[PDB]
Design a protein around this nucleic acid. Structure first.
Ligand SMILES: [Mg+2]
Ligand SMILES: [Mg+2]
Ligand SMILES: [Mg+2]
Ligand SMILES: [Mg+2]
Ligand SMILES: [Mg+2]
Ligand SMILES: [Mg+2]
Ligand SMILES: [Mg+2]
Ligand SMILES: [Mg+2]
Ligand SMILES: [Mg+2]
Ligand SMILES: [Mg+2]
Ligand SMILES: [Mg+2]
Ligand SMILES: [Mg+2]
Ligand SMILES: [Mg+2]
Ligand SMILES: [Mg+2]
Ligand SMILES: [Mg+2]
Ligand SMILES: [Mg+2]
Ligand SMILES: [Mg+2]
Ligand SMILES: [Mg+2]
Ligand SMILES: [Mg+2]
Ligand SMILES: [Mg+2]
Ligand SMILES: [Mg+2]
Length: 131
RNA sequence: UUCCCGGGCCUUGUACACACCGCCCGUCACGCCAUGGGAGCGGGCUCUACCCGAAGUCGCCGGGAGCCUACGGGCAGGCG
């Protein structure tokens, strides 16, 4: 018996592979299906990825944004079917895996610490040029 | 003729004038009106210091990087 292998077999039915790769510090726009009454639509949530905790299929990530003066954080299951798509708005360069410190920074101070990551931006540009 | 009462004439003081059975002061009691002080309570204006900070002009960059060119250039964009 390989208990770890049996678990992966169960989850393989629900594993997604159509989402783009990103890192904490990147600016990301998540398009999420919402239910309001008896209707379904798509709501976009755009912000800075501050945390990705990995458990294989059970991976989740957290996105932070300031909306109408109030900070908001949303935690998403990475393989959730409720995610329509994820867009890469901006590539950021961080020096650590968890970015809880930006909760106590102003907008100018956040822009200083999370500067654009040139190397990964060029890789996104080199990709998608295969037209 | 000292004293009690009443009167006469002159003079003197007066805050009295239906005129001393005149006038008049202050506390206290009650009522009305406005007001000072007062643990505090609720507001308005204003000053100083620091924090965040839109638009926009201005200054610097414009690259490890987009667009235009008449390019020792410009626009977008970034920083202050
Ligand atoms: Mg973990
Ligand atoms: Mg990890
Ligand atoms: Mg775990
Ligand atoms: Mg979280
Ligand atoms: Mg979490
Ligand atoms: Mg992380
Ligand atoms: Mg990590
Ligand atoms: Mg960390
Ligand atoms: Mg931290
Ligand atoms: Mg006579
Ligand atoms: Mg006399
Ligand atoms: Mg007289
Ligand atoms: Mg009288
Ligand atoms: Mg009297
Ligand atoms: Mg007295
Ligand atoms: Mg009485
Ligand atoms: Mg009284
Ligand atoms: Mg008073
Ligand atoms: Mg009083
Ligand atoms: Mg300022
Ligand atoms: Mg300032």
């Amino acid at each position: 018996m390989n208990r770890g292998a049996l678990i992966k077999l169960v989850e393989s039915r629900y594993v997604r592979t159509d989402l783009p790769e990103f890192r904490p510090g990147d600016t990301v726009r998540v398009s999420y299906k919402v239910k309001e009454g008896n209707r379904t639509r798509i709501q976009d949530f755009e912000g800075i990825v501050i945390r990705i905790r990995r458990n294989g299929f059970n991976t989740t990530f957290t996105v932070r944004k300031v909306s109408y003066g109030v900070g908001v954080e949303r935690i998403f299951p990475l393989h959730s079917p409720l995610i329509q798509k994820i867009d890469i708005v901006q590539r950021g360069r961080a020096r650590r895996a968890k970015l809880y410190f930006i909760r106590n920074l102003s907008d100018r101070e956040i822009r200083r610490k999370l500067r654009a990551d040139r190397k990964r931006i060029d890789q996104d540009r080199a990709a998608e040029r295969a037209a």
